[PDB]
From TrEMBL, chains A, C, F, G:
Lineage: Bacteria, Pseudomonadati, Pseudomonadota, Gammaproteobacteria, Enterobacterales
CDD domains documented for this protein: PIN_VapC4-5_FitB-like (cd09881)
Domain PIN: start-end pairs: 5-125
Known role: Toxic component of a toxin-antitoxin (TA) system. A site-specific tRNA-(fMet) endonuclease, it cleaves both charged and uncharged tRNA-(fMet) between positions 38 and 39 at the anticodon stem-loop boundary. Its toxic effects are neutralized by expression of cognate antitoxin VapB.
Recorded GO MF terms: endonuclease activity; hydrolase activity; magnesium ion binding; RNA nuclease activity; toxin activity
Designated name of the protein: tRNA(fMet)-specific endonuclease VapC
Top-level taxon: Bacteria
SUPFAM superfamilies: PIN domain-like
UniProt-listed Enzyme Commission number(s): 3.1.-.-
From TrEMBL, chains B, E:
Family: Belongs to the VapB family.
Family annotation (Pfam families): MazE_antitoxin
GO molecular function terms attached to this record: DNA binding
Xref: SUPFAM superfamilies: AbrB/MazE/MraZ-like
Ranges for domain SpoVT-AbrB: 4-46
Species per Swiss-Prot/TrEMBL record: Escherichia coli
UniProt keyword annotations, A-Z: DNA-binding, Plasmid
The organism's place on the tree of life at top rank: Bacteria
Record's protein name: Toxin-antitoxin system antitoxin VapB
TrEMBL record, chains D, H:
SUPFAM superfamilies reported for this sequence: AbrB/MazE/MraZ-like
Keywords recorded for this protein, A-Z: DNA-binding, Plasmid
GO molecular function: DNA binding
Gene this protein is translated from: orf6
Organism: Escherichia coli
InterPro entries hit by this protein: Anti_VapB2-like, SpoVT-AbrB_dom, SpoVT-AbrB_sf, VapB_TA_antitoxins
Organismal lineage: Bacteria, Pseudomonadati, Pseudomonadota, Gammaproteobacteria, Enterobacterales
Pfam family, one: MazE_antitoxin
Name used for this protein in its record: Toxin-antitoxin system antitoxin VapB
């Protein structure tokens, strides 16, 4: 069964720099990792805005084909709505897409893997790991 | 898990997977590996080292993430 | 059998103000209407951020239980990534949630139902109606 | 108010609306909405009348949408 | 949600709920409430004040929770 | 949709003392509350060991009939196995049934309602409220 | 078509030591075997508490994917509550997880498969086999 | 090792075991086990041979069960 949801920041970081430290974690936890459809939208955007969309898109599609992509459903949206209010009423900012990724994981009990721990630590009830 | 049976198809010998054991429909190719009297079928090209050693992205893939803030 | 996707603005407009013109449209078009999961997170946020969450949540449920909620899937994610690029340096701004609503609609061929076309007018290939 | 009793028919599970609160004979077909443990029985094409005429949000609901970019 | 139709049953007028809108099977009785041309059906005896004001437990219901530790 | 999973301790507390403070929360959040099957096993045990099993059992059955009971499934068991190890490797004790309740909520993203916050705060990634 | 419920002790015994006598029994009785969700949390705990979790998790999955996992339901919860009382002051001790395994088995009419009958011998109305 | 190609049949989705790694004609029916993205094809009644003969836990696995009451 799945265990980790990779954040958008760690995906870009991995796609760009392909670091061996993250390669170890990927080989070790292969099959237990997923991304939010929100993250898929961001990297497809990163590809389409490049000077070589089809090329960069093709390395995106190879990365995605190795992980499950989870649809952002009513459960994810519900938890995200909670998180937006839980953060608002404590004044701690988190970016809009990161809120949606946060709620998707919490809705399923998944561990967020991110290199931006300072923001995701602002979300209540969510487990964070840094694989970078 | 689920049981099944073997057939004699496309002039060879194949076997079905009911939905309970069916693969993701995006798996177009598979590796078949022989262990004892048992066969192991896995999605072809799934390994991470293959993608980590392969084609890179161009350098312009992030001028910013463009998350509003 | 679906035709219209309600954006977020028409929902708040209806949930907050309950216009009689809208109840005629909703009764007439009942069965053909849906929202994106992105829109659902916003109205859940409005309830949870309010002074009387449990109350506002209950009227959200009564509203949402009368419409289909569509998961924001890979098809929505690709189209939104496309739409963001069509706009990015080639045009005019659209807010992040509205970008996801636009591409989700395009992904399924649905008509956007809105009370404020001013932003959605910027999206290519998308049919829009004003129900306010 | 009056009560009732459930039962099974064609594998589903209906309820006999009492004589005191039967629907108008005009209502040949119905839209059924599920909210919590309650279920709302609306005549087809009058599905939203209960929700519009019924209970309402608090006035503070969301005066702002709070989408970024503004 | 799901649509349906009315019948003329047990010498009265009842209506089905497909599984998508069917109630928990443990609901043996229901309250029917009339609002406009619409009827609201809710599980009978669900309200909390009714149980909070009703029968108490005997005083011996916890000599301990008996969770090991 | 559900939001709260009531712990076993708060249930006994409520069944025994029926406090008005908890009555307010019950009326306010009615329909959004559940218990784990683990909690059902504990109160049925409390009933069966009493001097008036059928009587006390009958007030149990009236309480349960007003809330959804969630089966302790593979997702709940998986999260509980994680929690047992996450607690072990930090040396913080939690009782066996409470571990299972904790994991059931986390598996679904539910808020635990308990009056024993000092123990449930030891569990990572879980949201706690005290309704007493 | 089910007959046997494997307790936790037979699982560890098999997963740790892989006895040849057991592979004959498992091959022969394949399709008739299950575990309780309670047992699943224990082997997941063993993996997560180990020095090599990802590895041990993978062999857990291969094992579990060959057997049905039964949700611990209200029927299991009532029977376990009954069993706890039949023992409570009227007999001899049984550990908490084994109490849940016993009542779950009784709830479905399954035979307990174990390598250590010493505790399960204390439960009324339950059929037991020794497969070690 | 050799590869293969999926296809559709009777709404499900099989695979043609190559001539080089076909099963013994003795295997008329099969048990299929799903683990991650891989699927294990075992002859009926030999379902566990792959798991017993295959990979194994680390020796520290769980020397103690750690159930309370002891």
């Amino acid at each position: 069964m799945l265990k980790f949801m990779l954040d958008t920041n760690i995906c870009i970081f991995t796609i760009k720099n392909k670091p061996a430290s993250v390669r170890e974690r990927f080989n070790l936890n292969q099959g237990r990792m997923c991304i939010s459809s929100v993250t898929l939208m961001e990297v497809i955007y990163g590809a389409e805005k490049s000077q070589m969309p089809e090329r960069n898109l093709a390395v995106i599609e190879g990365f995605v084909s190795r992980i499950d992509v989870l649809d952002y459903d009513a459960a994810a949206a519900t938890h995200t709505g909670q998180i937006r209010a839980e953060l608002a009423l404590q004044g701690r900012p988190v970016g809009p897409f990161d809120q949606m990724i946060a709620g998707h994981a919490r809705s399923r009990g998944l561990i967020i893997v991110t290199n931006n721990t300072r923001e995701f630590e602002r979300v209540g009830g969510l487990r964070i790991e840094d694989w970078s | 898990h689920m049981e099944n049976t073997v057939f004699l198809s496309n002039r060879s010998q194949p076997v079905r997977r009911p939905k309970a054991v069916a693969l993701p429909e995006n798996v177009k190719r598979v590796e078949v590996i022989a262990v004892g009297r048992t066969r192991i079928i896995t999605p072809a090209g799934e390994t991470w080292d293959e993608w980590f050693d392969g084609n890179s992205v161009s350098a312009d893939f992030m001028d910013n993430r463009e998350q509003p803030g």
